[PDB]
Design a protein around this ligand. Structure first.
Ligand code: FES
Ligand code: FES
Ligand code: FES
Ligand SMILES: [Fe+2]
Lengths: 416, 180, 180, 416, 180, 416
């Protein structure tokens, strides 16, 4: 490839996406090197590893990582690969561990993936460097429950990276003194399409998905959208009405969300009515692969496979003090709608698969896609909302910002 | 299991047939897209369950399935189902999505009675075969553990409990739009 | 369908077995390459049918299968079959082609009577598993809708009608040399 | 690759094919760009879309196209891809349509794939160019029933392209005042082997396939072969006897083909006995991927997948006025012999699969294949037949011509 | 075959069920990882056989299977089995390997008697479905030819002979750690 | 790639393997050209083709070869590809043949793959060169039962290539006047991992595999390792005890191996007690893909597929005069332990699959693997054993030698 022509792949002012970004093999290897190996990725939620020694295995990019709670309750994230011949160190999806031993040749590790013992280094390795030969470690950082990692010892801080995005994440994560716990169990499915489609997207009529709606009723809206200043994040939401209530989450989960004690109070840590209770559904995407829907409350990582396939790891989060049966609702309603079986998300999948399939073709790959929807409709000072806010919510501004940061990541060797 | 720590047995064979024939029929409806008629088989206290499964270390096999207060693939009310039927019927009427080709192979059906006249407890095997649009194909297998109740319908039974034990870690297709 | 808008039912169970055992046998012949003996099961008015299936929009499910004046995968006379048997026997004698490994899993067999003593109407399920030369593998599923006729042979029946409803849009293998 | 060494891949005078043409990935992408995106491809038959608004979906190369009958009974062929994010526009194999709507985001199209409506271009797209943002359209042209398309606005006319090939196509397509209708239904299968093998080929003993023959009998021949002047087409046939009669099509379909009214008369639009009735079986290949067998009457497109896989879309055509039961015979006999289940074509498939499989090997890919069969046995003036005719029919002259045009297509940037 | 050159037949149907139910149970144990209990089904003269299969030219079909003095996939004593059970139990106790998800679809069961009270001879069909760790999946099919013996256990039978006829040239997975 | 940076892939003095050697696609194509197409590969054993005209089909690299016993009892090895269009010539796994005919177009071959007849070369091919147009032939050579081939007419002799490796092969192959016969039947399975992992490896704790051991009992050892001077071979064994006896092969096969007539005598053709009877288990790897375990007596070829997949073809060999039931033991015990179903080898497989899977990741591919185990612990003169012998057997010296020859093969255009 080449610094110059990578850049020609996306025209921001004028809304052209070159479809090759979604398909190209070497381009993919660069994302892996210049996006994932340098940005903050979503490993899961704290609740999924309470006790010391609890682990769960996931991915940063296409590197399997082990995620382990330590004795000082810190969170260690090391590359799930023995450095001897590259056997997998941790082998279940989840569990508790006193230590870790590499099944192939004995090399033993501690709770934070430090090579602590080789059998008979007496006999052999005339002085072996244990530290050097431990797996690669990843910078871990936490945002109000969400676990994040980044390989780059030079990456900016997580708060910096996030920038004023923290604001919109607070809509789901900080609406109660007691934080938020993740309902246990993580659904996983495979969806042969580029990771960017999922992330960009998904469900972007921020006009059908109709039958999904008609499921939750027993028979032209106001809102805004935020584009991040720096790091390609972005969020989109409504203001007052059904949709959340009827349709997606039902009666109870909306009473809870909009009226009554838990929503007024608690939710007034946000220092804003409406910001707390006249909210309704909300998108939100934290570059590159972190996605969640405050109000519904599925969180996902998208994991890249091909440039042509992605895996979807999704769980659900509830306020940790929410009433029993309200937590229960979140559980049922979430899976009813935004799971792989869900009455909404079962369609988002069907789609992207076709999108990718088509791009097997020469002509399908030779003219750009249109992303010029609702240009220059942002002021960047809103009384209430930080960053770069559009006031008609039907725009591809957040999206443009996504591709634009992608472009910045793809063309830097250093940090801009 | 409970009910299956010990071998059934023996019944029937009029009974054995009667159950198998129920399932074969249920599969016919499912594969023929005859969905209105299928939902009609669910008892109004239907609990339709498919837990998420995890790859575990052999001593921890135990921890495989998600328990009942945790996230599932499926955990449906009569009311939630009623609602999925609305999604299906609604796609058929006003929508341009393509129809989906399924097969349900039903097999190792084992029957034990329960309390009430009335109600029987079942273990069966699986393979579902789903082809759709040109070349997509997924094959799923597993165990249905059902509670069936006798019934005055032409179908003869209604499904009060269904627990779907998939032989699948990560879900290998791209959606779960059909019904086991 | 006709015959299957409504639930069978009930027969048999001596009958149920008798049919299932017919199919299990038929599968044995097919999988054991014992072809001479298989063709012998076809009634001289055998009509052996496998329509082409199309991906359709959900309201047009109706239009899926090719009808009877249109192109099929299979639409065979007794005479045409006799002729395929000649191809098979001829490859065996003078030819260097390799033999082909099949399995026919037979299952959800439902039985209703017809007019004549004599003649029964059937719905069954499918999976055919075909492996051949080193690594090739295709898996097919679907429904056989057969008309069977009683018969004085050791086999007990003869296939007068077979309609093979594949769960397959485009054919996913590279040929259809076996027999459902 | 490179203009010079692409050319070294095929030596015409001296019959060497370099096996890499069948396997190479980048080479494949060039075919897609320089063969398929610039030549006339077979979309199907008119009969498959009689009424206005009838569509059927197929492929030009690896681009899915929608093929739609218009109000003025014209045939519109547009790229089956919404230009917004590349969702599939038409989603069934076939059907009738008043209009087309893109399921993902509402963008609505007319019968000929013109973007006619976006929801709320009021709100957004400060003037969107509807024409620009419609799918790519393809030049459509028809030859006596056969539907053809070509993306290149500079490609030669279809008649020109065909050249004197029209002559041999007339053997199947124009043997009756009333033209020809395609029996409905198109068989499709997958055959992991290079598209050129299928096209070149198939069934080229123009010496077994024996058992197939022995199927149609209830127990060293004369003929010629034609190689196109220009565009790599070619045909091969017989003169008087069984083979057609006995064996392939049987009694009735040969009486019909060779004797009696329909064959004498009607068939004498061709202005030649023998050309009409002493014909027997016939090959015929219209570059690059169109193939049919006049006398048997399967037509196929070969659709490219890998350089390593091809799909076979085949239907059958009958004279539109042929007697009922004669049409019926064509239906049964065709499928009995040249379908995926067919007693002939079930073997052609088995073969090519091995051919491709072998070329996974280093040594299998390193010496050329022999295509020197029956060289310099053409006069180019035959009393009766146009073009370049061989008089012993057992030659690879047509084939050489195929690879030779391929070579011309692969090495031009412009039209020679 | 011997025993299957000619059609079973007919038995049972109490018998037919009794056998099928044996197999369904056996599959339950296998798929539920309940291995201690499974081995207990093998007669102490169990001979557990799975010959290697070869792609052959059609006239030489005959030569497909490895005979009894030649290399197999499996050729086990009671003693050798006892020993595999030790491997399984030993992995469970002290070891970090992951557990493995299986399904055994049992089907075309045909029954003929033998000499002795006592002992029955069986042909059945197959599909085994094995998913493990995230995404690995293999599907196997074939024929079990078993000799079963009556027995005073709660299981009712013991497997004295098992011959596993895989529909597989080269083995398409990466190991054969489960049990047909 | 490039002579210089291929070399940087493996640092010998300092034990670094760059994980890309296991994954890289173009690198793979070079192995195919510079390792397999120039080295001596294992086709099987003589016994698998006794009678004239017996064939068996296998692989050299990814080229299918036919292996045929001739009238003069010589062994012909020709590329299993008709030179006309590359159809497969021999089509079963094994059998007997008077001649060979290419099913596609008649071209007929003799027992040693010489094109002897084309139908009607009268009609066509104005003088065809039969010799030229036969398949590629491979140099065949035999070592005390083992059949070997090599395409390179310039490769060194097989004995030279082997060098002093013959010594350690003699431990299994020449321990009786009457040589060794291969028990019929060859197990084959697929194992998605790089061929080098298998070869390097396998089972290299020359510390678990525990349960496998505990299978053969009914409830820190001495030894050496050899690294070849020239061609990257290597072997590792023990001296006195259980392990062989208990555990792997059991009672009988160890009595036979260690004590009694057959082991003392016969085995004293080796001219060394201990070399014959105080041996126990033994590794052994003949570059690049030949592996066997004298004492257990499975032999395997590893066949390359991807850089990402390998097939394992394994049989078993017994001394041709061994007692009936002793041969029988070898049969059962071998398959019980080192088959795809085996209580040992079923685990070796599970492993490598993970190893390869991990390397799908960017970070997993970016730091080297450690192969510095037990450096500079070789004298090269041992009283008894030729070559380069380590005296503590727990080292990666043989392995280093493997990668080192690989490196030599990969970087020569000529023979060093
Ligand atoms: S890879 Fe050898 S210790 Fe794990
Ligand atoms: S892709 Fe957005 S309108 Fe179809
Ligand atoms: S490839 Fe034509 S003779 Fe074999
Ligand atoms: Fe029964």
């Amino acid at each position: 490839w080449n610094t110059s022509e990578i850049e020609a792949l996306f025209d921001e002012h004028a809304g052209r996406i070159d479809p090759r970004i979604y398909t190209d093999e070497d381009l993919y290897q660069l994302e892996l090197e210049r996006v994932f190996a340098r940005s903050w990725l979503l490993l899961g939620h704290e609740t999924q590893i309470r006790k010391p020694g609890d682990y769960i295995t996931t991915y940063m990019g296409e590197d399997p990582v082990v995620v382990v709670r330590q004795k000082d309750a810190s969170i260690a994230v090391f590359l799930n690969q023995c450095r001897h011949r590259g056997m997998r160190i941790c082998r279940a999806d989840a569990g508790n561990a006193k230590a870790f031993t590499c099944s192939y040749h004995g090399w033993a590790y501690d709770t934070a993936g430090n090579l602590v013992n080789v059998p008979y280094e007496a006999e052999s390795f005339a002085c072996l460097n244990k530290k050097e030969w431990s797996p690669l470690k990843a910078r871990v950082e936490t945002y109000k429950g969400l676990i994040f990692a980044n390989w780059d010892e030079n990456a900016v801080d997580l708060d910096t990276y996030l920038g004023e995005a923290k604001f919109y994440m607070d809509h789901m994560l900080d609406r109660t003194e007691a934080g938020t716990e993740a309902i246990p169990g993580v659904q996983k499915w495979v969806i042969p399409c580029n990771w960017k489609f999922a992330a960009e997207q998904f469900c972007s009529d921020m006009t059908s998905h109709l039958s999904g709606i008609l499921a939750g009723l027993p028979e032209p809206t106001v809102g805004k959208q935020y584009r991040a200043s720096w790091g390609g994040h972005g969020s989109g939401f409504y203001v007052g009405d059904p949709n959340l209530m009827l349709a997606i989450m039902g009666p109870k989960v909306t009473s809870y969300w909009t009226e009554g004690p838990a929503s007024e109070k608690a939710a007034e840590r946000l220092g804003s009515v409406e910001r707390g209770s006249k909210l309704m559904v909300e998108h939100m995407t934290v570059f590159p692969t972190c996605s969640f829907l405050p109000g519904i409350n599925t969180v996902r990582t998208w994991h890249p496979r091909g440039p042509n396939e992605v895996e979807v790891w999704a769980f659900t989060v509830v306020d940790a003090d929410a009433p029993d049966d309200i937590k229960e609702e979140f559980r049922r309603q979430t899976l009813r709608t935004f799971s792989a079986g869900g009455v909404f998300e079962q369609d988002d999948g069907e789609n992207w698969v076709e999108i990718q399939h088509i791009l097997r073709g020469h002509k399908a790959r030779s003219r750009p896609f249109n992303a010029e929807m609702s240009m220059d409709q942002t002021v960047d000072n809103d009384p209430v909302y930080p960053g770069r806010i559009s006031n008609n919510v039907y725009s591809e501004e957040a999206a443009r910002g996504l591709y634009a940061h992608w472009l910045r990541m793809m063309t830097s060797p250093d940090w801009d | 299991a409970d009910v299956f720590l010990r071998k059934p047995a023996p019944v029937a064979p009029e009974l054995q047939h009667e159950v198998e024939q129920f399932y074969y029929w249920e599969a016919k409806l499912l594969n023929d897209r005859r969905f209105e008629e299928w939902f009609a088989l669910l008892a109004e206290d239907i609990h339709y369950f498919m837990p998420i499964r995890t790859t575990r270390i052999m001593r921890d096999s135990r921890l495989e399935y998600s328990g009942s207060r945790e996230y599932a693939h499926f955990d449906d009310d009569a009311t939630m189902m009623k609602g999925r039927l609305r999604k299906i019927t609604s796609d058929v009427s006003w929508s341009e999505n393509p129809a989906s080709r399924t097969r349900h192979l039903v097999s190792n059906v084992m029957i034990v009675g329960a309390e009430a006249e009335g109600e029987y407890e079942i273990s069966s095997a699986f393979i579902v075969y789903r082809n759709r649009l040109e070349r997509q194909l997924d094959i799923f297998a597993g165990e249905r553990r059902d509670t069936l109740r006798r019934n005055t319908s032409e179908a003869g039974f209604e499904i009060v409990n269904r627990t779907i034990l998939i032989d699948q870690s990560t879900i290998l297709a791209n959606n779960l739009s059909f019904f086991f």
